């Protein structure tokens, strides 16, 4: 039963804390937590390749893509491993994240600890935007906040 945590911080008001739990190895991962400071609506929520922030969230790299696939949605088969879809910030800018994903893992080759979790500016179009940016970043906009996913107690 592995557990992980990640603290989203950026150069803007957006700040959050997200927890990950995998009670069984190679099984579904529960991702729950809270983000604040967001604009009301949908926001991109992804896991990028590198846990690197020497130059901020931009140092995280692209969406964690170990299988060299196109960008899609959490339920799509054509997706990056880090494609977790969108989170919803309510009228108070609080996103109470609750997600369950079975492609990301806390171990193995799809393992995401030591990688960066990022919440974005715009909304992920799930790879259906009709441009080359849609099949890569989902037109989710700039990187609002990010954090290294580390082992938690």
């Amino acid at each position, epitope marked *: 039963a592995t557990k992980a945590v990640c603290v989203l911080k950026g150069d*803007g*008001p*957006v*700040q959050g804390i997200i927890n990950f739990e995998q009670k069984e190895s190679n099984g579904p991962v529960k991702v729950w937590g809270s983000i*604040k*400071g*967001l*604009t*009301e609506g949908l926001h991109g929520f992804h896991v990028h390749e590198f846990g690197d922030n020497t130059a901020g969230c931009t140092s995280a790299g692209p969406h964690f893509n170990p299988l060299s696939r196109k960008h899609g949605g959490p339920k799509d088969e054509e997706r990056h491993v880090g494609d977790l879809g969108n989170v919803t*910030a*309510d*009228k*108070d*800018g609080v996103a109470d994240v609750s997600i369950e994903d079975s492609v990301i893992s806390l171990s193995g080759d799809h393992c995401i600890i030591g990688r960066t979790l990022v919440v974005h*500016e715009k909304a992920d179009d799930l790879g259906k935007g009709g441009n080359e940016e849609s099949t890569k970043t989902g037109n989710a906009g*700039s990187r*609002l906040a990010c954090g290294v996913i580390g082992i938690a107690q």
Partner: nanobody
Amino acid sequence: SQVQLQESGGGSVQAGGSLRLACVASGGDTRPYITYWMGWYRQAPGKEREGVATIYTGGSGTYYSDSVEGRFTISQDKAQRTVYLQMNDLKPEDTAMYYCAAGNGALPPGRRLSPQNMDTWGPGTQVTVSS
């Protein structure tokens, strides 16, 4: 460079009347994802800073104090970056210098209408009521 606030619309009024308190923000961080919790406040003669209402510039959340009820109504035009604090059904203990202010958009609940967690303040206009 600094988020300057400027209030207006305040003055003298009688008990049981309306008085619009509008404040236009200027300067600072004008990127669209910057969010504040814009709150109107109250320094009564001899008291400390109170706090009447607050709104979110990144959504539509409105939080009020208990001293006020269905008497005030706070709204916003985001394009004009202006917050409107309607003030109808006024009583004589509302006499105070009403300032508006802006705090962090991720300010947790409760601390939203706290004057200590507030960043920048406005000059202020006095809203006196007569009975």
